[PDB]
């Protein structure tokens, strides 16, 4: 890897610079390099890794949706034939997206997850695993579509089981996991009732635990609770 010769601390320093410059591809490459040093990541470092790839793949997903919509329109009756170009370019963006997902999943499998013993780290990585299988599922149309969806579900479910045993209901990782697993149910598993039940139950159990928190923890937890509420409002 092209980051093999750079110090771990220098990679982290540059990831932070890249974030400030909104250079997310660079940020992601720096963090991949840092992970490949083979040491466990701190909480701050895990956040850098997740922010980087979230922004890169988020952009690819947005572009893929623009292109898929144009392609869909092209296959409506009355649309004049414009050749293979729309499909080709949607495929190009799709393949790059799958590449990024495969890269993240590879980092998690080699060897972030297996070295993650504390609940906070393990849940965080398993959530990411769910997220990146979810992104693969969004674009999947073939023989493996069901297995991709199940891979997402399985990762989310393990994360959920740990989070419920080991973390308080207001823990931002537990919250963010529930938020995303709820979206998985609504958007990927065709289970809107499960999505709604999960978001509601998570919101309500968090509400009842807010009294235990400092002002700063309250701010963190309520921000994510509002996202649960936003989704519920969208869905009901």
């Amino acid at each position: 890897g092209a980051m093999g010769s750079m110090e771990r601390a220098s990679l982290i320093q540059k990831a932070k610079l890249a974030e400030q410059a909104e250079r997310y591809e660079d940020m992601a490459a720096f963090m991949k390099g840092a992970v490949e040093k083979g040491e466990e990541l701190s909480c701050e470092e895990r956040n850098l890794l997740s922010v980087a790839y979230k922004n890169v793949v988020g952009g690819q997903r947005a572009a893929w949706r623009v292109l898929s919509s144009i392609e869909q329109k092209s296959n409506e009756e009355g649309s004049e034939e414009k050749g293979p170009e729309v499909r080709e370019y949607r495929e190009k963006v799709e393949t790059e997206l799958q590449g990024v997902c495969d890269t993240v999943l590879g980092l998690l499998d080699s060897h972030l997850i297996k070295e993650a013993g504390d609940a906070e780290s393990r849940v965080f990585y398993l959530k990411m695993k769910g997220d990146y299988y979810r992104y693969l599922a969004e674009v999947a149309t073939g023989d493996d579509k069901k297995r991709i969806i199940d891979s997402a579900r399985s990762a989310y479910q393990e994360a959920m089981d740990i989070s419920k045993k080991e973390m308080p209901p207001t823990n931002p990782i537990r919250l963010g996991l529930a938020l995303n697993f709820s979206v998985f149910h609504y958007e990927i598993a065709n289970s809107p009732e499960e999505a709604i039940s999960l978001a509601k139950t998570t919101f309500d159990e968090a509400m009842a635990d807010l009294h235990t928190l400092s002002e700063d923890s309250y701010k963190d937890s309520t921000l994510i609770m509002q996202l649960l509420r936003d989704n519920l409002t969208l869905w009901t």
């Binding site: 997220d131 963010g176 938020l179 995303n180 979206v183 609504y186 958007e187 994510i224 996202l227 936003d230 989704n231 969208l234 869905w235």
Partner: peptide
């Protein structure tokens, strides 16, 4: 589309 983090 819905919120995720």
């Amino acid at each position: 589309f819905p919120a995720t983090v």
